[PDB]
Structures are given as C-alpha cells and as structure tokens.
Design an enzyme around this catalytic site. Structure first.
Site, PDB file in Angstrom:
ATOM      1  N   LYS A   1       0.776  -1.237   0.000  1.00 14.89           N
ATOM      2  CA  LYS A   1       0.000   0.000   0.000  1.00 14.89           C
ATOM      3  C   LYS A   1       0.810   1.291   0.000  1.00 14.89           C
ATOM      4  O   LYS A   1       2.036   1.281   0.111  1.00 14.89           O
ATOM      5  CB  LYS A   1      -0.966   0.001   1.189  1.00 14.89           C
ATOM      6  CG  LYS A   1      -1.864  -1.229   1.258  1.00 14.89           C
ATOM      7  CD  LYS A   1      -2.780  -1.351   0.045  1.00 14.89           C
ATOM      8  CE  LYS A   1      -3.827  -0.246   0.015  1.00 14.89           C
ATOM      9  NZ  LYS A   1      -4.802  -0.428  -1.100  1.00 14.89           N
TER      10      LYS A   1
ATOM     11  N   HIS B   1      -0.852   4.925  -5.713  1.00 16.23           N
ATOM     12  CA  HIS B   1      -2.107   5.634  -5.941  1.00 16.23           C
ATOM     13  C   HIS B   1      -1.913   7.137  -6.110  1.00 16.23           C
ATOM     14  O   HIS B   1      -2.502   7.935  -5.375  1.00 16.23           O
ATOM     15  CB  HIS B   1      -3.065   5.363  -4.780  1.00 16.23           C
ATOM     16  CG  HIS B   1      -3.414   3.918  -4.618  1.00 16.23           C
ATOM     17  ND1 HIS B   1      -4.130   3.218  -5.565  1.00 16.23           N
ATOM     18  CD2 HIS B   1      -3.136   3.038  -3.628  1.00 16.23           C
ATOM     19  CE1 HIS B   1      -4.280   1.968  -5.164  1.00 16.23           C
ATOM     20  NE2 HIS B   1      -3.686   1.832  -3.992  1.00 16.23           N
TER      21      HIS B   1
END
Length: 372
Positions: free
Chosen positions: A76, A95
C-alpha cells in the site's frame, strides 16, 4: 547484478496482505536475490515463515535507514504524514497517477530524494496486460459475502443486517463458515439460490464460481454472463430474477444500466443480494445505480430502498481481497514473480522501463518552486 529486496511492513490500517510471501521469498533467494523482511504483527503471515524461507529479519521501519541500493517493496501507499525524502527505488501501489488528493506531494517526496517509483498498478507485460492484481480473490471473497448475506436473510428478520466481517486465516476457514450459514438457510426451507455473475469469464468471475462450487451451489444454479450477454443492453430481467447477483465488470461510460429501481420495485423480484465487486464511488456512470455508499468490513451491506419485493441489500466493499489475505497474497506474489526476476536488468527490461518512464511522465507534471 545481484538485487536486494526489502519487504517493508505495511502501515495502512488493517492491511494484512504482503507483496512478497514466504514462498516467493524462498524462490527469489534461490534465484540469487538477497531478501530482507520487516517484522509485521498485522501481516497475515507469521514472521517465522519468512525466517525459515531464508529472509533476513529486521525491525519494522528499517527501510528508512537501509542502504540506498536496496529496492523497497511494499503493497500500500505511504503515510501522508511522512514527508521525508524517498531515496530508494520503490515498488508499491502508490495511488498517485489518477489525480488522487495529494498526488503531487507523493511524487515530490521521490523527486526530492532522487528515488524512483515502479507502481504495481501499472506494471504490465508487452501486450499491455497487468502482470499482477487481485481479481480472482476479489470475486471469491465477494461471492462468499454474497452467499452469507443471502443466507442471513433466510435465517433472520429484515430488522437485522449482516454483522461485521473480518479477514480469514485461510480459504478452508472461509468456505467452512459460508457453508455453515448456507446449510442453516436451506434448513428453513429456502431452495439453493440461483446466482447471476456478470463478467464470468475474467479472473473475478472464475473466483466467484470457485467459491460457489466449493460451498455446494450447483453449476446449474449459476448463470454465467459476460460481454456476449450484456451486449444486448440493459436493464436485464435476469438480475431481479436471480437470488444473488455478482458483478465483476467495471463500466464507466454513458450506457443503459444493468438494472434500476424501476425494475427492482416489483413484488415478484427474487433478488436479495447484489455484490458489486467493481464498486467504485468515483464512477461517474455506475451501471448498477441502486447505491451510493461504499460498504466496509464493519458494516458490509447497505439497504437498497425498494418499494416492492423482499429486502434487498448491496455489498460494495472495494477491498474484498482483504477477506482472504493469505491466499490473495500468494496469488499476487506468484503473478508478480516473473517480473521481479527481471529486476537485475530493470534498466533495460520493458516491464520496468515502462514503469520508470510512467513515473518520469507524472513527475514532469509537478511544477514547484522547490525544484528551481
């Protein structure tokens, strides 16, 4: 040309999957790689599994002071609260390529430290296909919760909702739990449910079908749809007619929806549960316009406010693979391994060069006075 990988412990709350599993670490070491693995209590994997795989065990956060030649791999994104320069080459889902809030700041950390980002979400083969994702277990987990909600509705009153769910240690445990709920539902007189799966040919579809078979739901009870069928154009009468509807196809363009409230507000509707594995709150054109909430593990379902027909709920969890972290991680790492073996030649290997060039492109979009 020996490469050293350093698996950093995840910091993102409740993230229990890992980019590298003990099995993949063993294989990489067998291929000449040197592997460091940070201790991570929240990981579904016991640190001792990595130790036995041959990894050098280090403290969580050790990557921050690790030699600059080590490639830091994690799953992540980094904590937005961390602001120090990123000097290493990193492999992760950052992201920050889809204009996410604060994406420029994310890249600025790499720019300041002269680090590099190889984003996992965009790593693809020469044909343009992603090398590693979590499709299969997203569908598997989705189908599992779908059956559990359907079963819950057979054994409880409409005044109650499916309770909070939590990650399972292994597939067997999840199948056993779903099977128990399922059998208890059938005990009341409910018939085996009919399940419609849109996107039955992809990995998400394969995953959903695998869960259904393992729980005991007959192949005859599963309507496997894909582009061939959806091309007819919605709304589809097959959705309200099914007991459970699982969607695996992501659609975001202006087209007739798969279903709508007009079709759901019918007393003859059999549909009880909708699992939208492709759920995305940021979708401007949701093909299943019957919910606005992205459900979560602690509150997995949301009511669809119908005016006719039995209670209908939606599951719109966007991280279904987290329900089976171990298997999700094994499949992901396995798919990623071939690309990892090319790291020694990452300077020229297209899979990594593409990722580096993508990184450079987005960095070039960042204009800041601090770069002058």
């Amino acid at each position: 040309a020996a490469v050293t990988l350093h698996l950093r412990a995840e910091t993102k709350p409740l993230e229990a999957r890992a980019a590298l599993t003990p099995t993949t670490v063993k294989k990489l070491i067998a291929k000449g790689f040197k592997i460091y693995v940070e201790d991570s209590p929240q990981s579904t994997f016991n640190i001792n599994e990595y130790r036995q795989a041959g990894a050098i065990i280090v403290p969580a956060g050790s990557w921050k002071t690790a030699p600059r030649d080590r490639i830091i791999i994690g799953l992540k994104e980094m904590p937005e609260t961390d602001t120090f320069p990123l000097v290493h080459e990193h492999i992760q889902f950052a992201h920050c390529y889809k204009d996410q809030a604060g994406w420029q700041n994310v890249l600025m950390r790499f720019i300041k430290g002269h680090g590099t980002l190889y984003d996992l979400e965009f790593l693809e083969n020469d044909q343009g296909r992603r090398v590693a994702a979590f499709g299969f277990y997203a569908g598997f987990a989705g189908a599992a919760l779908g059956v559990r909600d359907w079963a819950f509705k057979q054994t409880h009153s409409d005044d109650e909702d499916l309770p909070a769910v939590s990650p399972y240690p292994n597939e067997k445990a999840l199948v056993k739990d779903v099977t128990k709920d399922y059998k208890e539902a059938l005990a009341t007189g409910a018939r085996k449910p009919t399940v419609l799966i849109i996107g039955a040919l992809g990995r998400c579809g394969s995953g959903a079908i695998d869960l259904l078979h393992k729980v005991g739901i007959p192949d005859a009870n599963i309507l496997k749809w894909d582009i061939k069928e959806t091309s007819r154009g919605g709304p589809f009468d097959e959705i309200p007619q099914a007991d459970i509807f699982i969607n695996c196809i992501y659609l975001s363009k202006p087209i007739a929806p798969f279903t709508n409230m007009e079709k759901l507000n019918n007393p003859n509707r059999r549909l009880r549960t909708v699992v939208d594995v492709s759920a995305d709150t940021t979708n401007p054109h949701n093909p299943i316009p019957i919910y606005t909430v992205a459900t979560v593990f602690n509150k997995p379902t949301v009511l669809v406010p119908t005016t006719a027909g039995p209670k209908l709920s939606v599951i719109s969890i966007d991280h279904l693979p987290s329900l089976l972290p171990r298997e999700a991680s094994e499949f992901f790492s396995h798919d990623l391994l071939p690309s990892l073996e090319l790291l020694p030649q990452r300077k020229t290997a297209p899979v990594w060069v593409r990722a580096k060039k993508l990184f450079d492109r987005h960095c070039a979009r960042v204009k800041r006075s601090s770069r002058l």
